[PDB]
Structures are given as C-alpha cells and as structure tokens.
C-alpha cells in the first residue's frame, strides 16, 4: 500500500531534510509505504510555492508536508481551503481558524507572557523580526496596556549585511540613553547569533543585563559565548534531552554519516528538524488509523490541474483531516494533541535558564497551568518586646510575616537576607527569657527552642553569659549596654 504524498522543502534546509528521512526509515511499517516525492524550492517566492503546489496536485497526493514563510503563508492557507488538501507543517502558527492545516509547532505567546511576570518586569525592550509574522509582537502590545509595561519594540529584520555593525551600535546606544537593562530577542537562529555577537562586541552581557531568547530552540544556537558573561539569559525549549525517547533518538542521531545525512552527526538537534521527525510519526499514524476504520479513500480518478473553472474539491479529503486531528501520539516534543483547528494543545514547554555550568531547567509550561516552577529554612525564636518586636494594629488586617515590626524585626530581616535565608518569626509566649534552671537545668524560653533544636536562629535582645556560651554559639553583640535602675 504505497500512499503517495508530497514534499516542499526550502533550499538549504539540510537538517530538516535529513530528519525527514530518519522517520521515513524508522516509522516505515510492513503494512503500508509512504511515497515522499520531494521537491526543492525557495519558500519566500509565492510563484515558486504555487507551481510546486500545482505540480504535486497534478500528480495527485493525499497530503503535503512542507514549510511556508511569512511571504507565502496565505498562498498555502487559501489553496488548502480550496482544494481541501491537508497540509502538515512545522512553521509558525497561522492566526485564525484555518481548515486543512496542521501546525506542528506549538504556540509560544502564553509562555512568553507568563515568564515576564515571573521576573516581575515593568520596563523592557523587545527586539523583534518580521520573518515569522508579527503575532508575538501583537500579543505583548495587547498585554502591555492592561498590565502596565513600557515596551520599546524595535524592528531589526530590515538590515543589510554591508552595514550590520554600524546599525547595532546605533541600536544599543539608543537603549543606553533609555538605560534599558532588559531585552527580549524574538528571532530565528541566525538573527540571534548575529545580535549576540554584537552584544558581546559592544560589551553588553555583563551582570546587570537580562535576555530572553523567545523561540523554541534555546540550546539550539551557540550559547557558550555568553555563558560566562554575567548577564542572566533565559529561554524556551520543547526538546528535553532528559527524556528517554529523545535519548534513544540522539544516540541514533549522533552515529549517522555526514555525506549520507548532512548535519546528523551532532550532539543536539534543532527544534525545526525535531518537529520534522515528529510529523512523520503523525503522517504514518493517520494511515494506520484510516485503514483500521476501513475507509478506503483511494481516489484513483485523475486529480487534474489546480486551475479548474469552477475548482471542485474531492470529499475523501474531508476524511483525511479528521483522521489527522484525531491523533494523540508521543514524540520528541511530548504529547501531540490537536484541536479542531489544526493547532496543538496539551503540550509542555521547558522554561530553561542559563547558568555557568550550562542550560538548566527551572520548570515547564502548559495550557491548563502557567509556568510550573519545578525546582530541585530558618525558624526565628524570639519574644515581642518594645521596640524590638511589636504586634501591629493591622494584626487581622495585614497578613503574612509583616504582622510583627520593630527594631529587632528590621535587624532580623537584615541578617537573613544578607546571609541568604528568609526568616520565620514564631514567638513562644511563655514570657521567660530562659536560663539553665536550678536542680533541673531546663532552658526555659527562647533558649528552650534554641538549645533543644526546635528553632535554628534567634534574633532577640538576649544576653551572652558564660553558661549561655557553653551550650550554643552566639553572634557579636548588637549594642553595648548595662544594668540600669528604673524609678
């Protein structure tokens, strides 16, 4: 059963073409065969997309895998609505409700918005590129009004290579006059590697700066050159190598031949080529599910041209996309669950952050829940005394740990944060300051929590004495004092 499909690949899209053939060998099954019939083209030329589309529709196909771009996306979404030919693609998500289009790329804009409040940003810049649409820009410009931001969004795509270096200096000299410390980069691989090479050359990656590379490959581009700078770099990745099914792929992926598969013998794989491998699983899963339902859709009647007057669909194309949307399998990115539209749902995006050892993982994101901060102290025994620790008039009003205030309360908060901890004031209200008792030797009050190990730190007006010094360690004296008479 040789199912014939079609391929529209960009010129110079080498690693995606290799990652296409990897799934064609592995996900080939004994019971049917997928015929690729791959064509090569330049994806931004909508003439060149068109006659390569009508060529394969003259050949007759059941589905088409391929890429689009911003300057060709409406040529695709019009034809697949018209001729009812489904289209599976890893490119950027179309905005709207388009039939017959399977976006293999997850949406990003919720995760990107969720990240910014996690860092609690109020004023930042946003260097964007026109190549992937303006959807991510339009979302954060919608979000910046209602949540009080100052977004200085600057287009960067329209720059010619003869005058790159003169422009990026002139770009970031503007941001210094604005004193911008925070930057979101929103580009593909190449414009990230250009900008990061220009960030370094002007020296704008020291501590005090922060970057967010807003695409799905965070470890995809070169990142060693800003690993050791001082500026914290955050990012987004869908291909977690800690997963076993990914690790089974990489050990197969690293072993391959260069002239047989260009770009295969690497340690990492790019997310664009990752979804290219993921879709061939999804394309194969349909024709498993299609004959399992025994819906024979073999339209051996000749498809004819694309310029039919009137152009007529073929109703077995309606059968195909319902199978394509009703696929839930597992791949490199994770759970592949679709909508009625063609967009992905029930997926995970790993919020990763760059430390000196390398990329770490500080959690994941979903639709149902926001940034899930998947990571991986002291207990203050004291007593309330004026003006050391005082019970606020906003006792029931103000909740939390600012419910007590005073001189000791500031100094407890000074001593926890310069050391690194966060305080937990809990006052044992027995009233006794505590000493080693006669005939029983029980530490009574604040030392009853401290010597017996029921608390860790004790910020209190407590006296260091000889029998006090023996049982537990002390700090330096706050102030010098004495015994005073009160009348």
């Amino acid at each position: 059963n040789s199912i014939q499909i079609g391929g529209l690949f960009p010129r110079g899209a080498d690693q995606e073409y290799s990652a296409f053939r990897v799934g064609m060998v592995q996900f080939s099954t004994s019971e049917f065969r997928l015929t690729p019939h791959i064509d090569n083209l330049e994806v931004a030329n909508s003439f060149a997309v068109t006659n390569a589309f009508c060529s394969q529709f003259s050949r007759g196909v059941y589905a088409i895998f391929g890429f689009y771009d911003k300057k060709s996306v409406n040529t695709i979404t019009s034809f697949c609505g018209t001729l009812h030919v489904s289209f599976i693609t890893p490119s950027f998500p179309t905005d709207g409700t388009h039939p017959f289009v399977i976006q293999m790329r997850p949406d990003l804009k919720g995760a990107l918005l969720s990240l910014i409040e996690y860092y609690q940003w109020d004023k930042f810049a946003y260097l964007y590129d026109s190549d992937r649409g303006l959807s991510t820009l339009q979302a954060v410009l919608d979000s910046a009004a209602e949540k009080k931001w100052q977004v200085t969004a600057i287009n960067v795509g329209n720059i010619n290579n003869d005058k790159k270096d003169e422009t990026y200096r002139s770009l970031f000299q503007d941001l210094e006059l604005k004193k911008e410390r925070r930057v979101i980069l929103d580009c593909e691989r190449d414009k990230v590697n250009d900008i990061v090479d220009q960030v370094i050359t002007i020296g704008k990656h020291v501590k005090g700066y922060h970057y967010i590379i807003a695409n799905l490959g965070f470890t995809d581009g070169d990142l060693l050159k800003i690993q050791f700078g001082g500026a914290e770099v955050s990012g987004f990745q869908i291909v977690d190598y800690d997963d076993s099914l990914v690790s089974k792929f990489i050990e197969r992926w690293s072993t391959l031949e260069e002239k047989e598969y260009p770009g295969a013998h690497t340690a990492t794989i790019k997310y664009t080529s990752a979804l290219t491998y993921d879709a061939v699983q999804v394309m194969t899963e349909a024709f498993r599910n299609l004959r399992k339902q025994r819906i024979e859709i073999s339209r051996r009647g000749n498809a004819g041209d694309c310029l039919a007057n009137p152009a007529v669909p073929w109703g077995q194309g309606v059968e195909i996309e319902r199978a394509l949307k009703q696929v839930q399998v597992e791949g490199l990115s994770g759970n592949i669950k679709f909508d009625q539209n063609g967009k992905r749902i029930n997926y995970t995006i790993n919020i990763m952050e760059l430390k000196t050892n390398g990329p770490r993982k500080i959690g994941y994101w979903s639709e149902v829940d926001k940034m899930v901060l998947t990571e991986d102290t002291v207990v203050v025994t004291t007593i309330l005394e004026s003006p050391y620790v005082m019970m606020k008039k906003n006792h029931e009003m103000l909740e939390g740990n600012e419910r007590y205030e005073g001189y000791c309360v500031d100094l407890a908060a000074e001593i926890a944060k310069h050391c690194g901890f966060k305080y937990k004031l809990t006052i044992v209200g027995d009233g006794k300051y505590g000493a080693r008792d006669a005939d029983t030797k029980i530490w009574n009050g604040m030392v009853g929590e401290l010597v017996y190990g029921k608390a860790d730190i004790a910020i209190a007006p407590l006296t260091i004495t000889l029998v006090r010094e023996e049982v537990i360690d002390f700090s330096k004296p706050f102030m010098s004092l004495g015994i005073s008479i009160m009348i």
């Binding site: 001593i415 209190a460 700090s475 004296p477 004092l481 005073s484």
Partner: protein, 50 residues
Amino acid sequence: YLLESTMNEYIEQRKPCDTMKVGGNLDSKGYGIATPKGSSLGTPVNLAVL
C-alpha cells in the same frame, strides 16, 4: 526595678513619662544572635552582623 539600659531608655522616651533612668550602667552585656553550637548560619551571620 533594675533592668536592661536601652529597655529602660525606651520607656523614658515613650510618653507616660513617669519613669527615669538614674545613675548609669552597672554592668556590660551583649545582645547577640543565639545560634546553634556549630551553627549552619553563624559564620555567615558573624560577618553580616559586623
């Protein structure tokens, strides 16, 4: 009623105003943070106090 000096000084500035610190200090004592013996936090505290 003999007590701590700055505790006696605070009531004198607070305004029932019927209290009086007389003479001076009769000892010298220290207000230090009680930490466990061999503390997990004390040596970072000891400089951060200073």
